[PDB]
Write an enzyme that holds these catalytic residues in place. Structure first.
Site, PDB file in Angstrom:
ATOM      1  N   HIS A  37      37.370  39.335  58.291  1.00  0.00           N
ATOM      2  CA  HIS A  37      38.416  39.239  57.443  1.00  0.00           C
ATOM      3  C   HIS A  37      39.212  40.363  57.938  1.00  0.00           C
ATOM      4  O   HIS A  37      38.554  41.379  58.548  1.00  0.00           O
ATOM      5  CB  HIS A  37      38.183  39.176  55.875  1.00  0.00           C
ATOM      6  CG  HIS A  37      37.339  38.170  55.326  1.00  0.00           C
ATOM      7  ND1 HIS A  37      37.890  36.908  54.966  1.00  0.00           N
ATOM      8  CD2 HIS A  37      36.136  38.207  54.899  1.00  0.00           C
ATOM      9  CE1 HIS A  37      36.771  36.337  54.417  1.00  0.00           C
ATOM     10  NE2 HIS A  37      35.935  37.154  54.353  1.00  0.00           N
ATOM     11  N   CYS A  87      44.775  38.490  53.656  1.00  0.00           N
ATOM     12  CA  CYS A  87      43.751  38.482  54.793  1.00  0.00           C
ATOM     13  C   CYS A  87      44.581  37.759  55.803  1.00  0.00           C
ATOM     14  O   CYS A  87      44.881  36.551  55.354  1.00  0.00           O
ATOM     15  CB  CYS A  87      42.415  37.837  54.684  1.00  0.00           C
ATOM     16  SG  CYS A  87      41.286  37.298  56.016  1.00  0.00           S
ATOM     17  N   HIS A  90      42.669  33.848  56.498  1.00  0.00           N
ATOM     18  CA  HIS A  90      42.690  32.830  55.362  1.00  0.00           C
ATOM     19  C   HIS A  90      43.895  33.273  54.485  1.00  0.00           C
ATOM     20  O   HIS A  90      43.607  32.717  53.235  1.00  0.00           O
ATOM     21  CB  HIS A  90      41.341  33.507  54.671  1.00  0.00           C
ATOM     22  CG  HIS A  90      40.125  33.206  55.908  1.00  0.00           C
ATOM     23  ND1 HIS A  90      39.436  34.335  55.837  1.00  0.00           N
ATOM     24  CD2 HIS A  90      39.718  32.096  56.178  1.00  0.00           C
ATOM     25  CE1 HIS A  90      38.436  34.008  56.722  1.00  0.00           C
ATOM     26  NE2 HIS A  90      38.517  32.730  57.079  1.00  0.00           N
ATOM     27  N   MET A  95      43.610  33.963  50.250  1.00  0.00           N
ATOM     28  CA  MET A  95      43.024  35.323  49.980  1.00  0.00           C
ATOM     29  C   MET A  95      43.816  36.524  50.023  1.00  0.00           C
ATOM     30  O   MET A  95      44.218  36.866  51.324  1.00  0.00           O
ATOM     31  CB  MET A  95      41.943  35.100  51.117  1.00  0.00           C
ATOM     32  CG  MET A  95      41.042  36.320  51.255  1.00  0.00           C
ATOM     33  SD  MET A  95      39.517  36.340  52.410  1.00  0.00           S
ATOM     34  CE  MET A  95      38.855  38.083  52.092  1.00  0.00           C
TER      35      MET A  95
END
Ligand SMILES: [Cu+2]
Length: 102
Positions: A37, A87, A90, A95
């Protein structure tokens, strides 16, 4: 402050997704799990160029992912306000979190 990025079950979340820190207090993002991430700050439109430089320096590059081999990233923001971070892989999966600097 300390934020966990992901978990051992592969959920696309920041733990906690809302942190309040003092000006210049580092917030250390640490990867948990095997899913990579990263963390990039959103730059508020209308932000002064000093806030935009700060937010960019507090962001990971596009081509950068935390991994078991680079497990943390440290960001410092000294301007008061609240900032959103996300992120890049994502971002679609919601996220994201917020950083309130006092
Ligand atoms: Cu992610």
């Amino acid at each position: 402050a300390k934020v966990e990025v992901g978990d051992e079950v592969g959920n696309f979340k920041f733990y906690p997704d809302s942190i309040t820190v003092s000006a210049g207090e580092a917030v250390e993002f640490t990867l948990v799990g095997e899913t990579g991430h990263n963390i990039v700050f959103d730059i508020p439109a209308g932000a002064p160029g000093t806030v935009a430089s700060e937010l960019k320096a507090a962001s990971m590059d596009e081509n950068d992912l935390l991994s078991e081999d680079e497990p943390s990233f440290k960001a410092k923001v000294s301007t008061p306000g609240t900032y959103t971070f996300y992120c890049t892989p994502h971002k679609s999966a919601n996220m994201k979190g917020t950083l309130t600097v006092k």
